[PDB]
């Protein structure tokens, strides 16, 4: 899992050096920013089922054609899988917020996705529509702190760039 | 590798 | 490699459950006590030389048979490889202390170490002693109770850190044993 | 020059990645810790000639034999070069404190040191003793703030382990 | 590579002078305003897909001859390579913005780009256009005045950073020109 | 020898 520590320790292991100043200083960035992203993490865990339905909803509202036969949402079953993945992504987002890095999303969600979604005929724009809605639905003070929203949108923006 | 030579 | 945070994520993924209170609390403490840790890691990388030379040297003064024709520390080349191994070991331990996880010490160091020593004829029993003194030296430099080294860090409780670094030292011996 | 930024950008370039969370979060460490190391840095610049005489003195005060013929301090020429190197080191200490990493010391001070001092017959303990005194000379409240004496001592401990 | 702080050390080393107030001042503001810097950099990496696609697309809509039999953007393989080049350029721009130095963009990107483009037959004049549009988008996403992207970061002055990122975009255009 | 052994 890619984080502040894992990056700094891997850089040092490659150079055969003990942890030094920029290594300890890099983690001081940890101790400062944990609060923000850790807030957003609990916000997801506490209410992710309303976030996925909302995201899942907007998606099929934008692409109603998917409820056609030979499509990706031709039956409630495949429909259930759509919201299910949306929840996977959101759950890995929470992971990335707790880790403070993009590792959980990187290895558990983004690696192989393109091959999988192309091979399995799942339109990428639908996923992006689900995560664009989720990002913009965010309400600054209401839902989380200001810097927590930054970490929320940053993560969601990351997922979007990966699918475009 | 064309970035190296050129 | 993992750290304290990705370690919980791995365990929470197994149940496909977001991370909540139970698991968030402890990681919140990591942060709070987080400044103690950076000092703890620094206490190692600041005396990394003395701990290694003292531990390799101690293991030999107690087992002079090592620097004897037939000992694994005999010749400059075997001494230098053993000092280097102690430095490498103390380095991966320091990594796991900065991360709050043993994944990096076992994945990149203790992964095939003993079996490696088996082949070379490197005495695992002697190595387990060297590590034992390093654990003592390390443990002392973190608590600021070093017999010779006395620094000026603001007083507090570092027994969880001491107990954690000792555990890492213990998985080193446990691996080549 | 190795720093928090230089490491974080080097780790990302190696994987062809845009800067991400763990990268932006690591620089939040700079913004927290820069102040401290920036303090001691100006402490060195403001009084580096007084600190070096003190360091130089102890060195030759501990090891009188250096003032012997065929030695390293046999004449004021070689002696003056001793105090000069101490200053070079002390100046790279200032550099590393401003960089927030060990870059300056590593490339300009430690690289090749091994070969140079052996080839020129310069006892390493003489160097070590100069920086051990300098490190122990530091007085917690008197000379600098606590965390400024930390980067100061870390830096000096760094040079010491590099010589041993 | 260097960043804001080690670039000062380099110039002060040339004089064999410690770094003091005068030079410390500027580096202190770097810290001071450092959170705006982190934000600006994010505005780029946050819309980097749109910034490259819109710019590569723009350079073509103004010059249809690029996607024409004989044009350097003709075939999927040339289009994809151009989109890729646009993505790498903007990434090295984002690196330089994070470090406060161009040492990394010219050392690892612009070093041998022009000559490489000459050899490959890549139109440098057109490339300078994609780079120009990327400058505008980037400029827009940094100041938060993005026509389509509208975030809620606390209001302030980011003209020094914008003038700073623009300068990096300019060293690209000047480099392959 | 760490890999092989
Ligand atoms: C026989 C020649 C021999 C040696 C060299 C001994 C080894 C030994 N060290 C033990 C403890 C220990 N080592 C250090 C390091 C050390 N002391 C200093 O303060 C400085 C600085 C150095 C580096 C050189 C320390 C700090 C410790 C931990 C306790 C302490 O001394 O404050 C050790 C005991 C291990 C144990 O009981 O598990 C051994 C055997 N002693 C010799 O026999
Ligand atoms: C011909 C088909 C052609 C294209 C596609 C144009 C390109 C172009 N855009 C310029 C500026 C620019 N583009 C963006 C990106 C953008 N807007 C968003 O908010 C989102 C999201 C996207 C990505 C897709 C930005 C932010 C800007 C600035 C103003 C804006 O529309 O928001 C640009 C101007 C270059 C210059 O001033 O030098 C051009 C030419 N237009 C075409 O002609
Ligand atoms: C005191 C420490 C002990 C000692 C050591 C000793 N080991 C070697 C050589 C090797 N040991 C390793 C293992 C390590 N290198 C690593 O990279 C890692 C971490 C990832 C470890 C811990 C390996 C690869 C070798 C073989 C080749 C090499 O020099 O790199 C030697 C040399 C053995 C020989 O005589 O050829 C010895 C002597 N022996 C002692 O007595 C100690 C208890
Ligand atoms: C056992 C480990 C020792 C101990 C330490 C201890 N540290 C503090 C608090 C601080 N120490 C730091 C220093 C670091 N943080 C970093 O970012 C880095 C960068 C290189 C380091 C080395 C700072 C800034 C703090 C915060 C407060 C202060 O200025 O001292 C404490 C206080 C309690 C806390 O958790 O903050 C503790 C207890 N205590 C000892 O007695 C040990 C031997
Ligand atoms: C729109 C951006 C422009 C375009 C681009 C284009 N360039 C390539 C091929 C190459 N460009 C590079 C340079 C980069 N790769 C990197 O490693 C770096 C960063 C360190 C850069 C910026 C190189 C190495 C090549 C040669 C090999 C390749 O296929 O990748 C292509 C392909 C050219 C060909 O036909 O083989 C093209 C078309 N051309 C346009 O019209 C634009 C203005
Ligand atoms: C031009 C760049 C934009 C601008 C920004 C601006 N933000 C701040 C202050 C803060 N921004 C951060 C965010 C970061 N710090 C980090 O560690 C990371 C991790 C990913 C980032 C992206 C923080 C936490 C602050 C503190 C206060 C707050 O929550 O916003 C300022 C304040 C002034 C300053 O830092 O000097 C400003 C002005 N203003 C805009 O409108 C721009 C488009
Ligand atoms: C602030 C900009 C504006 C605002 C917003 C508003 N949003 C809702 C309700 C929801 N928004 C979300 C999104 C989140 N909930 C969370 O748990 C999290 C963190 C993971 C976020 C980002 C959800 C779950 C809902 C639906 C359920 C609800 O709580 O009622 C509403 C409801 C109105 C509607 O559905 O259109 C509004 C009003 N209100 C303001 O004052 C704005 C300026
Ligand atoms: C407290 C831990 C100990 C203490 C110290 C002591 N300090 C001095 C005088 C000096 N200290 C230094 C060291 C530095 N000055 C700096 O500029 C820097 C940063 C680069 C440091 C680390 C120097 C230069 C001196 C000499 C000149 C001076 O008076 O300023 C003194 C004077 C006593 C002496 O010279 O013998 C004391 C008392 N004394 C304690 O009680 C300690 C435990
Ligand atoms: C919602 C926008 C889209 C949708 C989805 C859809 N999902 C699949 C199948 C898969 N989804 C995944 C992706 C994930 N699962 C995970 O393990 C992870 C990370 C831990 C992710 C994000 C995978 C791997 C597949 C293949 C395996 C399986 O079928 O589950 C399908 C099933 C297709 C089918 O039954 O043939 C569907 C349809 N449907 C929509 O309309 C969307 C565009
Ligand atoms: C002080 C404890 C010791 C001492 C030193 C001594 N230095 C040299 C020669 C050199 N020392 C250096 C090292 C530095 N110069 C740098 O450029 C840097 C980093 C920017 C450092 C720290 C170098 C490169 C040399 C060679 C060139 C030159 O002579 O300066 C000598 C010369 C000895 C000889 O016979 O040539 C001296 C005397 N003398 C002491 O007593 C010490 C043990």
């Amino acid at each position: 899992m890619k984080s502040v520590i894992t990056t700094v320790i891997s850089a040092a292991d490659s150079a055969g050096r003990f942890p030094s100043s920029s290594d300890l200083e890099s983690v001081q960035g940890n101790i400062q920013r944990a609060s923000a992203r850790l807030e957003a993490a609990e916000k997801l865990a506490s209410n992710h089922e309303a976030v996925v339905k909302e995201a899942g909803d907007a998606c099929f509202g934008k692409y109603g054609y998917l409820k056609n036969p030979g499509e990706a949402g031709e039956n409630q079953e495949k429909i259930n899988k759509c919201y299910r993945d949306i929840d996977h992504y959101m759950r890995l987002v929470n992971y990335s917020l707790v880790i403070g890095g993009t590792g959980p999303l990187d290895e558990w969600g983004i690696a192989g996705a393109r091959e999988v979604y192309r091979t399995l005929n799942l339109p990428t724009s639908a996923y992006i529509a689900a995560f664009a809605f989720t990002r913009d639905r965010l309400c600054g003070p209401r839902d989380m702190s200001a810097q927590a929203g930054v970490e929320y949108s940053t993560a969601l923006d990351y997922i979007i760039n990966s699918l475009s | 590798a064309a970035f190296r030579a050129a | 490699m993992l750290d304290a945070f990705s370690r919980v994520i791995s365990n929470a993924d197994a149940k496909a459950a977001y991370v909540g209170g139970s698991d968030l609390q402890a990681l919140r403490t990591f942060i709070s006590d987080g400044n103690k840790r950076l000092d703890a890691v620094n206490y190692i990388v600041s005396n990394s030389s003395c701990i290694v030379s003292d531990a390799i040297s101690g293991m030999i003064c107690e087992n002079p048979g090592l620097i004897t024709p037939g000992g694994n520390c005999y010749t400059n080349r075997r001494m230098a490889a053993c000092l280097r191994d102690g430095e490498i070991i103390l380095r991966y331990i320091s990594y796991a202390l900065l991360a709050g996880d043993s994944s990096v010490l076992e994945d990149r160091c203790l992964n095939g170490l003993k079996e490696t020593y088996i082949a070379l004829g490197v005495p695992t029993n002697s190595t387990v002693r060297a590590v034992s003194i390093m654990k003592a030296a390390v443990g002392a430099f973190i608590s600021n109770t070093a017999s010779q080294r006395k620094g000026e860090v603001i007083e507090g409780d570092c027994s969880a850190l001491a107990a954690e670094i000792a555990s890492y030292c213990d998985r080193i011996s446990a691996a080549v044993s």
Side-chain angles (χ1 to χ4, degrees), chain A, chain B, chain C:
Chain A
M1 286 353 215
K2 156 142 239 213
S3 52
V4 162
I5 302 157
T6 291
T7 300
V8 150
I9 304 197
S10 267
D13 193 28
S14 286
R17 309 151 26 105
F18 284 88
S20 47
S21 43
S22 37
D23 297 348
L24 305 214
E25 186 158 314
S26 292
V27 201
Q28 181 57 237
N30 274 20
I31 307 158
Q32 293 299 335
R33 195 90 180 133
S35 159
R37 43 185 187 84
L38 284 197
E39 187 185 337
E42 218 178 69
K43 273 9 184 37
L44 271 57
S46 282
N47 197 14
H48 61 276
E49 290 120 312
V51 189
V52 164
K53 164 76 170 167
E54 283 212 342
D57 277 354
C59 166
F60 288 128
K62 192 179 155 68
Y63 296 110
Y65 79 102
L66 292 158
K67 261 164 208 122
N68 294 5
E71 273 318 325
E74 53 181 318
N75 61 34
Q76 180 64 51
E77 221 137 357
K78 315 198 116 168
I79 265 246
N80 279 326
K81 280 181 169 190
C82 184
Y83 287 70
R84 167 209 75 178
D85 292 339
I86 290 166
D87 199 83
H88 276 149
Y89 273 93
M90 283 334 280
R91 180 178 53 106
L92 313 182
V93 170
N94 163 261
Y95 284 170
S96 291
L97 294 176
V98 184
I99 307 211
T102 59
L105 273 167
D106 268 330
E107 310 188 36
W108 296 355
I110 291 145
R114 191 192 228 138
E115 297 76 30
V116 156
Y117 294 170
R118 154 74 286 109
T119 304
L120 275 89
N121 199 95
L122 314 158
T124 266
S125 69
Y127 291 96
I128 294 163
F131 300 122
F133 184 88
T134 317
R135 166 187 86 210
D136 290 332
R137 174 64 157 195
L138 166 87
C139 172
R142 183 205 119 97
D143 303 324
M144 301 133 22
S145 66
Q147 287 312 304
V150 161
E151 291 290 7
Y152 191 73
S153 320
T154 285
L156 286 153
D157 283 320
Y158 190 74
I159 283 159
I160 273 152
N161 273 312
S162 76
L163 279 143
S164 345
Chain B
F3 204 45
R4 298 66 190 101
Chain C
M1 101 204 227
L2 315 166
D3 56 46
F5 295 66
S6 56
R7 159 70 66 206
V8 165
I9 287 354
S10 282
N11 284 313
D13 175 54
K15 295 179 143 38
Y18 290 62
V19 167
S22 192
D23 321 291
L24 229 50
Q25 204 39 44
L27 284 184
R28 287 147 132 174
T29 300
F30 192 101
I31 304 313
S32 309
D33 289 5
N35 272 309
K36 315 213 244 149
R37 184 174 243 70
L38 299 196
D39 266 337
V41 178
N42 218 28
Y43 296 161
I44 296 181
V45 325
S46 264
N47 311 98
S48 33
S49 268
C50 133
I51 312 167
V52 160
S53 66
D54 182 86
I56 300 339
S57 232
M59 154 202 85
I60 305 170
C61 75
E62 301 179 336
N63 193 11
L66 270 158
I67 54 192
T68 268
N72 209 231
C73 270
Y74 176 65
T75 65
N76 270 122
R77 182 193 60 77
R78 303 227 269 227
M79 173 71 40
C82 170
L83 276 162
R84 184 197 48 94
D85 273 16
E87 175 191 310
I88 294 153
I89 288 169
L90 175 76
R91 183 169 49 85
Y92 275 103
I93 296 175
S94 126
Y95 285 160
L97 182 86
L98 185 74
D101 202 90
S102 79
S103 148
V104 74
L105 159 79
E106 295 215 305
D107 273 20
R108 303 195 199 197
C109 187
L110 306 168
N111 211 298
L113 191 46
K114 186 188 145 128
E115 304 82 31
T116 289
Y117 281 174
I118 286 6
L120 302 152
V122 177
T124 44
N125 177 213
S126 302
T127 314
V128 165
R129 195 24 185 167
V131 168
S132 292
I133 296 156
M134 293 212 294
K135 178 163 133 204
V138 152
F141 285 130
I142 289 156
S143 37
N144 196 191
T145 58
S147 74
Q148 275 131 43
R149 195 84 160 57
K150 286 129 198 313
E152 222 199 279
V153 85
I154 92 165
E155 172 188 302
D157 204 39
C158 318
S159 54
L161 295 72
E164 189 212 308
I165 193 73
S167 63
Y168 296 145
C169 287
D170 273 10
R171 305 167 52 120
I172 307 239
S173 289
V176 321
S177 306

